[PDB]
Design a protein around this ligand. Structure first.
Ligand SMILES: [Mn+2]
Ligand SMILES: [Mn+2]
Ligand SMILES: [Mn+2]
Ligand SMILES: [Mn+2]
Lengths: 198, 198, 198, 198
């Protein structure tokens, strides 16, 4: 049975880039709901799978992907941020970025665009294509998880649902984007990245 | 473990409206594949559900809905057709049609339109809305099953994937539509309908 | 040339159900942006259409549906609300609601459910089905407009994008839905309904 | 005014890989229909655009993408094939394939997989990513065109709508994919590729 992971920091450990109220609601309410509903959906599915009830299985897919995705996406997002974040990555990760996107700067401009380009709710991602052996940027709608729906390995995600910035940045998503770069835990992204090299 | 149901008639029992080659390929190859792939997907899912692997569960959804839907949809379609079909329904079913669509004729014109209106692969359906307590026509893309994705109870389905008519009607889907009315097993639809009244 | 319509009342006219900050931002920022991007996209589409550039036309569809839908939806929304609204509709609208949903309360629960059920951004609608000649509830994703994507004529819409309630209700979408019933302009809903008897 | 382009060879020029009946039907019937509906839809769109009818514009999008995409896709497809084709591409295209996919064989398996993997109707494509400056494989549903919906520049397309192979290969899509490699016009694929170095 899935559970809500604790934050590697305090609700206000990302200020002023992301005020405490956001982190609090985002973690304790939003993520909590996705976890809670994920467990319920899984149980219902197990029961449906046991009876060989295809219609019931299919009818549960939306709730599974949404809440399951929500759980996956936010769990990663918490580790992608840190009071000790900011700046630029070093070593291989940095070399890969310049390699695949030209420069760290162009990389940012690309991920920012993918993130700002989401119409409605969704996420912007920097992932790893194991097949092509290189980095790849992609956007996902609502809570659709990167790996489950694209196959790409999530390295860094940027939540662009309005609940991720509205209380502080209101309608100006671009400001949120520019600010979040200050709390990116490149240490964790590098770990996720290095895990792909193999 | 799901299995491929036998036809309530012979592969050529629907001629000339639907030649034997179609019925043969459609049942033994197409439906068979959906069943075969459905069992495999379910097993993989059970294993994924056992480990609490959300990404794996989500990644399997497409195959589940497609093959599961394929199994559901074709199983119904076989019972919706019959060498003893054709003509018009009688009793309550017929009264419901005139009630909800005006006349049996307008009903046909409506279901034919929904069926011909499908861009790409899909199905046209005459279903029952338990909530509204009346008949409702709807179209579904690819193998997405009616009940699992809309909640409507399937009463009559019209396969409009090209494999359902190309060998005989080629690109003229309208001809297939006009012809299939001759083999509709209204006896079975009435049964499905009466099961909804409760 | 499309234009941002003036609200039929002041930003604080809907207090305390929907506060002034939300109304001001929702109208002067959100709707304003949809209007300009709609105009720009229409102009770009005219140029593509004149040159017969099918690829350019198709590439513009997302922005056209998103911004055009955004304009259509919010224009209707403002008229659906009023400081002198709330309670139950008078006249035939109420009778149509009783007939198609059982009662006003059941209707309220169904539209609330449809609205709360939107995963991600979207809208909940009470619409009119011209074909069936009766009321029908539907939910639309992001800014996809009701009539243009479903054929249903919009009567009452409930915006469930997080920007419609976050500054006031936070994550509690249900409290927002509960409060909005207090400001529904049934006079406007009835006008939209009566125009469908055509 | 869009027009049905003449094939660069006779209907039987691709035998026995793709027979004459399929080529004749695919071109004179399928593509012909997409062309006329594209023209009609464009004209209807101009009228809606002139009146600023956003709902009408949005309602026309499905037909525009479907028929416009159908025209774009088949126009490219015909040029991608040749009686004098098959084998491996010569020049830089082959080197780009080796670089981005490892080898020609691996590339063939990937495009075959992407094509066979389409659930329902669609297309498999080898495209060029201008941003990343490299080759990329993608699959598109129904008639959604590659460039207009993904930004990738189409180099080689494989039609996997059942009408592209049913009269000859029946349900065995894999045999169709195997046979088509024998008629690929690499000269055309290379031209499309070289135009991307711009
Ligand atoms: Mn979030
Ligand atoms: Mn079928
Ligand atoms: Mn809004
Ligand atoms: Mn085709």
């Amino acid at each position: 049975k899935h559970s809500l992971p604790d934050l590697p920091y305090d609700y206000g450990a990302l200020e002023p880039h992301i005020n405490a109220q956001i982190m609090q609601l985002h973690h304790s309410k939003h993520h909590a709901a996705y976890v809670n509903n994920l467990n319920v959906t899984e149980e219902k599915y197990q029961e449906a799978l046991a009876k060989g009830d295809v219609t019931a299985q299919i009818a549960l897919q939306p709730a599974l992907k949404f809440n399951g995705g929500g759980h996956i996406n936010h769990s990663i997002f918490w580790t992608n941020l840190s009071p000790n974040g900011g700046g630029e990555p070093k070593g291989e990760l940095l070399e890969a970025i310049k390699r695949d996107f030209g420069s760290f700067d162009k990389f940012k401009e690309k991920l920012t665009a993918a993130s700002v380009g989401v119409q409605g709710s969704g996420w912007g991602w920097l992932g790893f294509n194991k097949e092509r052996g290189h980095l790849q940027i992609a956007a996902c709608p609502n809570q659709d998880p990167l790996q489950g729906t694209t196959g790409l390995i999530p390295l860094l995600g940027i939540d662009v649902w309005e609940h991720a910035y509205y209380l502080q940045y209101k309608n100006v998503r671009p400001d949120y984007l520019k600010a979040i770069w200050n709390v990116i835990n490149w240490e964790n992204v590098t770990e996720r990245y290095m895990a792909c090299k193999k």
